[PDB]
Design an enzyme around this catalytic site. Structure first.
Site, PDB file in Angstrom:
ATOM      1  N   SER A  74       0.859  -1.183   0.000  1.00 54.48           N
ATOM      2  CA  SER A  74       0.000   0.000   0.000  1.00 54.48           C
ATOM      3  C   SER A  74       0.895   1.233   0.000  1.00 54.48           C
ATOM      4  CB  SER A  74      -0.871   0.037   1.265  1.00 54.48           C
ATOM      5  OG  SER A  74      -1.505  -1.211   1.504  1.00 54.48           O
TER       6      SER A  74
ATOM      7  N   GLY B  76       1.987   1.148  -3.695  1.00 58.82           N
ATOM      8  CA  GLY B  76       0.803   0.808  -4.454  1.00 58.82           C
ATOM      9  C   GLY B  76       0.996   0.809  -5.963  1.00 58.82           C
TER      10      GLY B  76
ATOM     11  N   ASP C 255      15.755   5.593  -5.064  1.00 61.12           N
ATOM     12  CA  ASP C 255      15.144   6.921  -4.874  1.00 61.12           C
ATOM     13  C   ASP C 255      16.116   8.117  -4.857  1.00 61.12           C
ATOM     14  OD1 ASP C 255      12.791   5.468  -4.849  1.00 61.12           O
ATOM     15  OD2 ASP C 255      12.126   6.148  -2.865  1.00 61.12           O
TER      16      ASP C 255
HETATM   17  O1  LIG Z   1      13.256  -4.536  -4.102  1.00 66.29           O
HETATM   18  C1  LIG Z   1      12.899  -3.428  -4.435  1.00 66.29           C
HETATM   19  C2  LIG Z   1      13.625  -2.731  -5.636  1.00 66.29           C
HETATM   20  C3  LIG Z   1      12.622  -1.970  -6.572  1.00 66.29           C
HETATM   21  C4  LIG Z   1      11.761  -0.977  -5.574  1.00 66.29           C
HETATM   22  C5  LIG Z   1      11.356   0.315  -6.124  1.00 66.29           C
HETATM   23  C6  LIG Z   1      11.632   0.796  -7.525  1.00 66.29           C
HETATM   24  C7  LIG Z   1      12.525   1.887  -7.836  1.00 66.29           C
HETATM   25  C8  LIG Z   1      12.728   2.263  -9.214  1.00 66.29           C
HETATM   26  C9  LIG Z   1      12.039   1.545 -10.248  1.00 66.29           C
HETATM   27  F1  LIG Z   1      12.231   1.886 -11.521  1.00 66.29           F
HETATM   28  C10 LIG Z   1      11.155   0.477  -9.963  1.00 66.29           C
HETATM   29  C11 LIG Z   1      10.958   0.113  -8.630  1.00 66.29           C
HETATM   30  F2  LIG Z   1      10.103  -0.919  -8.456  1.00 66.29           F
HETATM   31  C12 LIG Z   1      10.609   1.182  -5.234  1.00 66.29           C
HETATM   32  C13 LIG Z   1      10.265   0.821  -3.864  1.00 66.29           C
HETATM   33  C14 LIG Z   1       9.449   1.772  -2.909  1.00 66.29           C
HETATM   34  C15 LIG Z   1      10.349   2.011  -1.606  1.00 66.29           C
HETATM   35  C16 LIG Z   1      10.726   3.453  -1.240  1.00 66.29           C
HETATM   36  N1  LIG Z   1       9.557   4.321  -1.350  1.00 66.29           N
HETATM   37  C17 LIG Z   1       9.157   4.491  -2.749  1.00 66.29           C
HETATM   38  C18 LIG Z   1       8.788   3.133  -3.464  1.00 66.29           C
HETATM   39  C19 LIG Z   1      10.692  -0.465  -3.423  1.00 66.29           C
HETATM   40  C20 LIG Z   1      11.458  -1.407  -4.272  1.00 66.29           C
HETATM   41  N2  LIG Z   1      11.862  -2.705  -3.835  1.00 66.29           N
HETATM   42  C21 LIG Z   1      11.157  -3.307  -2.752  1.00 66.29           C
HETATM   43  C22 LIG Z   1       9.988  -4.098  -3.002  1.00 66.29           C
HETATM   44 CL1  LIG Z   1       9.477  -4.279  -4.643  1.00 66.29          CL
HETATM   45  C23 LIG Z   1       9.248  -4.717  -1.945  1.00 66.29           C
HETATM   46  C24 LIG Z   1       9.702  -4.535  -0.591  1.00 66.29           C
HETATM   47  C25 LIG Z   1      10.868  -3.746  -0.308  1.00 66.29           C
HETATM   48  C26 LIG Z   1      11.569  -3.149  -1.390  1.00 66.29           C
HETATM   49 CL2  LIG Z   1      12.936  -2.202  -1.072  1.00 66.29          CL
END
Ligand SMILES: O=C1CCc2c(-c3ccc(F)cc3F)cc(C3CCNCC3)cc2N1c1c(Cl)cccc1Cl
Length: 349
Positions: free
Chosen positions: A29, A33, A165
């Site tokens: 969430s 999300g 990020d």
């Molecule tokens: O393993 C990853 C790497 C990709 C990612 C991204 C992400 C960054 C760039 C992109 F192009 C695609 C992505 F999926 C964003 C977030 C969130 C964590 C920090 N807050 C913002 C979003 C989490 C994660 N996660 C993640 C996931 Cl998918 C689930 C649980 C923890 C984490 Cl850290």
């Protein structure tokens, strides 16, 4: 060579992605999300797909979308989140209206791996070593992360880590207000806008993180900006004359001078029982005057990392052109620049 896409409902929204990506499943969430984990049958990697929705709803949002894509496409380092793929189901600029970003799935952030818990020294060495290796890379391209914290450090079960990020920090005053982790890792010069900051703000954040990994406790859990500054100055001492002059904000400088002077504390007595080399490094990262903080490159050669340091395997980045940041363009111009970047994407080997 447009792959075939299929549609699917996820998080009350329609995801349309190339067939290669299967088993899509929402990860969470909130800011989680718009992200789904999936299996990339082409590479055999478990991946994370983030869908930027209505990325061109405004001038500000169109530029943000361009900014994030430019940053992600530039990063090619093991300890930095980069792009495995970027796509849009649109067949033309006219239709272009959604952007999907694919990267590695780590599955957890440093919190879920350490919150309230003290790690072993070797584990801290390994984790901080990777953060600094990727930060060396990021800074070499003249990119400042500026909002480094445990929640933006992705780690898998083998404790391998990727920084994410970076260069996107655009928090609201409200989000930085009170007893919140969003501000506990910020360098004082940026938290209180003392001066035009630079990459050295990120080293301060690593020091905060390292201390937390060593003690299992937040280093500067301020209840607000002021309370936090007080916690910081109590540990590192009040600014000296030389640093006061560098505080271009007459307002900030004036407040700072109202505080009773305090000397820097003895870190060996704050981090009782910790490896003397870790204590030495914390003293070098947690310096109030940012000009005097150790750099990522210098920190990598610090003895604390003897077991991991390898000068031939700590790469730097190609130059990163951010001239666009000072440019004011129209929504369509920002959208068109984003489209070119999407269609010109070359997959990693
Ligand atoms: O393993 C990853 C790497 C990709 C990612 C991204 C992400 C960054 C760039 C992109 F192009 C695609 C992505 F999926 C964003 C977030 C969130 C964590 C920090 N807050 C913002 C979003 C989490 C994660 N996660 C993640 C996931 Cl998918 C689930 C649980 C923890 C984490 Cl850290």
């Amino acid at each position: 060579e447009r792959p075939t896409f299929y549609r699917q409902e996820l998080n009350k929204t329609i995801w349309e992605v190339p067939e290669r990506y299967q088993n899509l499943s929402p990860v969470g969430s909130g800011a989680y999300g718009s992200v789904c984990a999936a299996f990339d049958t082409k590479t055999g990697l478990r991946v994370a797909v983030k869908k930027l929705s209505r990325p061109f709803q405004s001038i500000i949002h169109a530029k943000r979308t361009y900014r994030e894509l430019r940053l992600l496409k530039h990063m090619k380092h093991e300890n930095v989140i980069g792009l495995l793929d970027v796509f849009t189901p649109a067949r033309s600029l006219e239709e272009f209206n959604d952007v999907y970003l694919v990267t590695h799935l780590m599955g957890a952030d440093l919190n879920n791996i350490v919150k309230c818990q003290k790690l072993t020294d070797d584990h801290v060495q390994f984790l901080i070593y990777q953060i600094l290796r990727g930060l060396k890379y990021i800074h070499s391209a003249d990119i400042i992360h500026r909002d480094l914290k445990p929640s933006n450090l992705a780690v898998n079960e083998d404790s391998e880590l990727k920084i994410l990020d970076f260069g996107l920090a655009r928090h609201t005053d409200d989000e930085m207000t009170g007893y919140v982790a969003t501000r506990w890792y910020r360098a004082p010069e940026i938290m209180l806008n003392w001066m035009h900051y630079n990459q050295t703000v990120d080293i301060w954040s690593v020091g905060c993180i390292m201390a937390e990994l060593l003690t299992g406790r937040t280093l500067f859990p301020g209840t607000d900006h002021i309370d936090q500054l007080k916690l910081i100055l109590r540990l590192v001492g009040t600014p000296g004359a030389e640093l006061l002059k560098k505080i271009s904000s007459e307002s900030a400088r004036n407040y700072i001078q109202s505080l009773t002077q305090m000397p820097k504390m003895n870190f060996a007595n704050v981090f009782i029982g910790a490896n003397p080399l870790a204590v030495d490094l914390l003293e070098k990262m947690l310096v109030l005057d940012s000009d005097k903080r150790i750099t990522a490159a210098q920190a990598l050669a610090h003895a604390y990392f003897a077991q991991y340091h390898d000068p031939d395997d700590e790469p730097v980045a190609d130059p990163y052109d951010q001239s666009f940041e000072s440019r004011d363009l129209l929504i369509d111009e920002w959208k068109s620049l984003t489209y070119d970047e999407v269609i010109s994407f070359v997959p990693p080997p």
